[PDB]
Design a protein around this ligand. Structure first.
Ligand code: LAF
Ligand code: LAF
Ligand code: LAF
Ligand code: K
Ligand code: K
Ligand code: K
Ligand code: K
Ligand code: K
Ligand code: K
Ligand code: MG
Ligand code: MG
Ligand code: MG
Ligand code: MG
Ligand code: MG
Ligand code: MG
Ligand code: NA
Ligand code: NA
Ligand code: NA
Ligand code: NA
Ligand code: NA
Ligand code: NA
Lengths: 323, 329, 323, 329, 323, 329
């Protein structure tokens, strides 16, 4: 407090003018904070609209390369790739995951060659490759087997490193998967490939639209009621070698972002998920909310402690920041 | 916890994109305040040898240069009048002259650039024959409360001239409260007070004394009875606590680079709007080295980034224009 | 706060007189805080001036011994040696580094014999010995190979211990190099040789003049924007066995010194680098700043939490402290 | 984290140079305050059997010895008058006598050694027939507020005599605020108040009582109704908080060595100028042991270093001259 | 603070009466806090006075058993044994240390048999058994060899456990000796033998009289200037398995006791050393200080955070507490 | 850090001597306060069925029993008058009757046992026809400030009777400050105020209501508008902070065992003299179980030790005599 008291202290003084608001402004969003998730199609010269994600398109790799030209020109530091697996590549083997000619691997090679400075974050998970939509070579009971699921994630991770990905991101919420991939990457010579852990991953309703986008929980994803638990999750991932840790979903979990940054003072990331994007975009299109909520929502992440934000608004935000 | 080689801190450093993602602090033009030395008269511009690249300017010239500063986005200027020798006195009356340089300059800038912040200097050092920041007793001691009376008159004259911020750099005890009371009583509800809270008795002020012309007046005189002992850190927290209690809208640590630890402690302890003055000597040291080819120009932004990393919200720096130019690229 | 309020509390009271200023003075610099870096030439009866470091001389070993007589008489506890490698001893083998007759090794033996109580801190690094100025048996891409660079640093470290150095200081910023040298020193019987880690080492412009002195970064040296990261760096070095940890450069990073001492309460050192020395010395010589800034700058390090300061002003400071 | 043998704490201890580099605290003469017992009369010097090496001195002799203390760099003395028996009374009026020993000694020292700090003792124990630090009621209880009235008069007389610091050792509640108010009202703006904040009801004061001549007056009397219970630590923090709020410039913990934990807590909690009195009994214990050949003289500096390590900024110690002499080497 | 202010708050109110002083009294010394160190002679029916420790006697084992009857009746929970080794049993072998018929071992057996509930803390150290007064099979340079010294301490520790000691206390300040003895005790089946580590052991002048008592430093004992260092020392001993940690000397280091208890919240002990005892006892005998300083000094240890106090005043204190 | 089997926590537990050495807390008689129910009249003793072993006593009988309590070392009693039904009223005037039971009992005990602490109860529940701790408005609400006026009169009457401590158990906002002001103004400088600070609206008070005879008056009435919601912990800290600011010498948490977490938080946050009342229901529960042979008598000391471990300095407990007896062995 410092015994600050009205009227000696009037907090409106600094708010009186733009210049003083700017001087005391505690946080600022910049393009350096933005990661753009992209849905990648197989094939050539194709784009598809996603009903529950207005404005977001699934893109074939050639189209991805065209759009990346502008993303790069805008300063967006990295993309997070999410392949849209053809149903015929799905299965049990769950081996389109480590397939060198799989969409993620092809997209990574293409982008790394064309835009060498652009960061590529690949998705380490099996569900986009399971006929049963499950992040595991599941058990005969339907429980997502933990350690066996981790086995799969490793070859996939190595395949991403082999394709040139600078960052692999296990989006799975299996216990101890960070250490396993880290060890594998180190043992294989991929010394500088980063591991972005989806550390505090909640069992959330906000993922709805993403499932629509990719064409695809309580026993592995965290209970939304729990906060302390998130700290234990992050601690474990850091101990296991993660270079960056993430809180998932974002705005509905800003308190978790704050606690995670405060507790560990580590590179902290946050995903503004499909559902968050869709509810904002829908309200803006309906004429219910001004466009300014986009930057307001992103500023919240910075204020809360996030270093980077995975957001489907990345291009629009970068354009506004440029302006 | 984190042990090598599971943890290799070089991974995030490997590439520009990851360095950008994890970068903890960034300097922007919103963090810059440009101090300016203001002359009397018309069409006057004077180079300062101990401050290479810095010029004293008459008000008309100040108005011309401000056009570029404003275009660059610099949010505020901090004005320092170069008082004519004949206007110095024992009573420092020129400090509250409605026609003093600081007052005239403020009125001119407020009219020409209404959105530009003007921070005036509340202190008697530019107006005394002896160069001390207050009024002297018969033993040569800078009287605290009697000095405050003059500082209050000065601050009121600045508010009347239209200054949005008055910045007491005097280091008298209790002056923030006295000034705040006076401002409130006079109806200057929104005039900010940027307290020079943890102001050190430093050797880094030399070039400024030349710039403003207080050097000859001060001679070999010191300010150890009011400016803080450089050895002291805890004392800084007590200084800031008092100024916040007394109504300051912003608190400042003075000099800058040689006191980054104080900036850090102050921001951490109080979570209040915190400044930091990169003083004349800091500017001169860096400029000298750059001009000799000893340091790359990049050191300017590195020095300024340090302030942000240390916890400062705003930086008084004679490099503000150069920095803003570099930032625009 | 303790509800301290003007005018019951007037902080100027203790400032009124020298005696009360002395009584409450929180920190004092002494000669026990000073480490003097020295540039050492090959050959005999030679000294060279360094254009960007006015007042600092490169010294042949015989000359170093002459000057050390006074450094020791002044109470300076330790020197940090930096050899000026002849271009013909440079290379790839990068093996002048562990050469028993290399400058550093020769200088160490000479000083240890003549001044047994004087601390000698040697520089564990390869760049002064690379034809390509790189702290590593570099890769074919130009990336400073981490683990392979560490291999080299070990024999060099052992060679320094073999020459009698009481402290070795890896100035390199390679991940996990402290543990490797510690293990090597322990395994070899050098139980009491100290390791002074350059822990929080920034990619800085302030090193300019040093490069001039020795005749010689973002992927290994730290981003000046980062503070939290410095804590993780120090933690790792302490876990790996460092006896002392250092923040590098100094004055532009005083906040880091403060955080490091507060967080770990370990022997903490700071380097007032060549650029800091040069900018101060230039201003003093130009008649822009009084000589008193030297002690002011050094006092700052103590106030900030430093136990020891590597400074090119060590002799001048010690002389003033003696006075 | 740190585990053997990666971490061997003996490494830094191996050599003098590394021990010096990592040494966390250092005692200097700037940390020393010398208490002195002052007699009435001329050419008087009296040995104190329970304080070997310490002498009571008349003012003329005090002035002579002070020459050496000042040459050694000792920043301040703390004066303790040895009140003549016939000047003791129920009302302790001698406490504020402008011609009392403390007042006369202060005037003499202020004139002879203008830079030397003089800390006077604000307390009524030397002036009462009963030896208590305040005025008694009909039940033999030391009245708080009535005592403060006398202490205020005393403190004002010290300020008038020129003392730069008054040090209330009385342990009345609220006396720091009362004295500060009085000093401020009288214009003694810069007179420091060194509060004996966490003052314990200790057995270590015996020799002092002999030195000052309050022993016979106090008899078997105690001070448990005002001096603190030695068992209490948290209470010390409340005592210091109040004295800071009330305006103390320095706060002190009393005795020293047997209360180093309190020094540590106080410095940690408040980050204010903290003192610590190495009392007569501490001095006597050490001196006795040294003179018997049981402890090496080195123990003097070890005892004083402890105070610095514990967090004290300044130490009242009867070893100040010896320490300063050893430090000069 | 809680905005407590005079005269609403008068701290003298609780001091007004004995009953309220008792109610708010924060700490109390009891016999449960006292450990009595005893100097043990070889032979029978002997006692010797120690010039620099007035009132303390060296005792032959039969005499020790006689005095222990009262120590036990007074409630003193434990003794710390210090044998007074005959010069002829001294040496190099330094093997009177692990001699089953050595004084410490004989005294332990005797006490354990006669007073089964009385705690016996033995001294693990070699110096009482070295002809050169050194806690190590020293080097040829005079440096107290660390690891080799630890070798000796282990058999001695086992010999104490074999004699029935419930607690062994390495008073040596060698790095990592706690782990070595712990491992040895565990490996040998001495599961419940406690290890009381002399953790923060200062190079002090206060040990003078003890050397007189037993008939016997900066490179192993801690610099009295250092406080943070004490925390690192204690942390290491706790990690190595110590059941109790000790600060040594006591009153001159009360701040360390406070920091150690606050930081680790572990069983914390403190030694009121020979020099502390002697200076108090001398002043009391000279008529300079009242006897009450004994309890005042011991109360300080409790207030500072000590759980147990090794003190030569234990009997006198226990007698007063009984009264 | 500590891992099995390097660390076996059972080692210190192996023997009584080591358990004693590491034992963190100890209960002593200095920690005990005995509440007593006082009857009007002469030679009256009445058993309380819901409080087995506890008797209401007339003053003459109280004086006789106090002889043993004092011999046992019990430092203080807390008096609770059993007000005759005909003395209850809307205005609770009996609360400040100089001839009320509490006042008479205090005078008698102060004369007979001058060193024994007497803590009187400041509250109107024993004196109102409705059993509430204050005065009611026309809506049946316990008026805060109007109640304070009566509590102040009561507290003054207790001070006049000689009580060393008044203990407001009313839970009106601001009453500690009002009472303190009144005590100070009247010259009762040293009368302690033991605030019932974090007083919960509990079901554990049943037997007390029987003991004092407020049960029939209260009927099914509640105190949720003034006593604290048992679910609330943070609120307790705000309650204590206010009472300390208002001048309380001691602060209390009420009930005890079911609120040990609050005792712990309160001691930790404020480091002030902290109490805790082991209430009638706690006593009854334990006594019932002991008498049924369900729990060993050892549970008494275990329950009391819990309070010390939780951070209490003193405990109000109807087991005080039994505990003191056991402690004497
Ligand atoms: O769609 C979901 O349930 C969340 C996405 C994942 O969990 C990816 F492996
Ligand atoms: O010159 C530099 O870049 C810093 C010096 C080092 O890094 C030494 F190995
Ligand atoms: O006498 C000393 O130096 C201390 C005693 C020890 O160190 C015991 F092994
Ligand atoms: K800003
Ligand atoms: K970022
Ligand atoms: K000092
Ligand atoms: K040092
Ligand atoms: K108690
Ligand atoms: K104990
Ligand atoms: Mg996990
Ligand atoms: Mg101030
Ligand atoms: Mg590192
Ligand atoms: Mg007080
Ligand atoms: Mg150790
Ligand atoms: Mg309340
Ligand atoms: Na996924
Ligand atoms: Na100024
Ligand atoms: Na280097
Ligand atoms: Na006194
Ligand atoms: Na020993
Ligand atoms: Na009640």
């Amino acid at each position: 407090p410092a015994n600050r008291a009205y009227p000696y202290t009037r907090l409106r003084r600094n708010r009186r003018d733009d210049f003083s608001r700017r001087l005391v402004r505690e946080n600022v969003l910049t393009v350096d904070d933005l990661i753009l998730p992209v849905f990648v199609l197989d094939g050539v010269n194709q784009r598809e609209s996603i009903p529950s994600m207005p404005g977001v398109e699934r893109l074939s790799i050639d189209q991805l390369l065209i759009e990346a030209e502008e993303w790069v020109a805008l300063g967006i530091p990295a993309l997070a790739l999410f392949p849209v697996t053809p149903v015929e590549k799905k299965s049990l083997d769950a081996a389109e995951a480590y397939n060198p000619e799989g969409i993620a691997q092809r997209a990574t090679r293409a982008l790394r060659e064309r835009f060498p400075e652009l960061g590529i974050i690949t998705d380490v998970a099996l569900d986009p490759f399971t006929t049963h939509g499950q992040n595991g070579i599941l058990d005969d009971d339907g429980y997502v087997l933990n350690d066996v699921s981790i086995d799969v994630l490793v070859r996939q991770a190595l395949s991403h490193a082999e394709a040139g990905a600078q960052v692999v991101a296990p989006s799975d919420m299996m216990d101890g998967r960070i250490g396993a991939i880290r060890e594998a990457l180190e043992s294989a010579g991929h010394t500088n490939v980063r591991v972005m852990a989806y550390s505090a991953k909640y069992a959330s309703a906000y993922y709805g639209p993403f499932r629509d986008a990719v064409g695809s929980k309580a026993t592995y994803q965290m209970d939304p009621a729990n906060s302390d638990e998130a700290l234990h999750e992050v601690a474990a991932d850091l101990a296991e070698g993660a270079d960056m840790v993430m809180v998932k979903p974002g705005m509905p979990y800003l308190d978790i972002v704050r606690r995670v940054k405060d507790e560990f003072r580590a590179p902290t990331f946050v995903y503004q998920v499909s559902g968050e994007y869709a509810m904002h975009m829908g309200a803006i299109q309906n004429g219910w909310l001004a466009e300014s909520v986009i930057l307001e929502s992103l500023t919240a992440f910075k204020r809360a402690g996030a270093d980077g934000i995975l957001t489907y608004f990345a291009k629009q935000a970068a354009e506004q920041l440029r302006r």
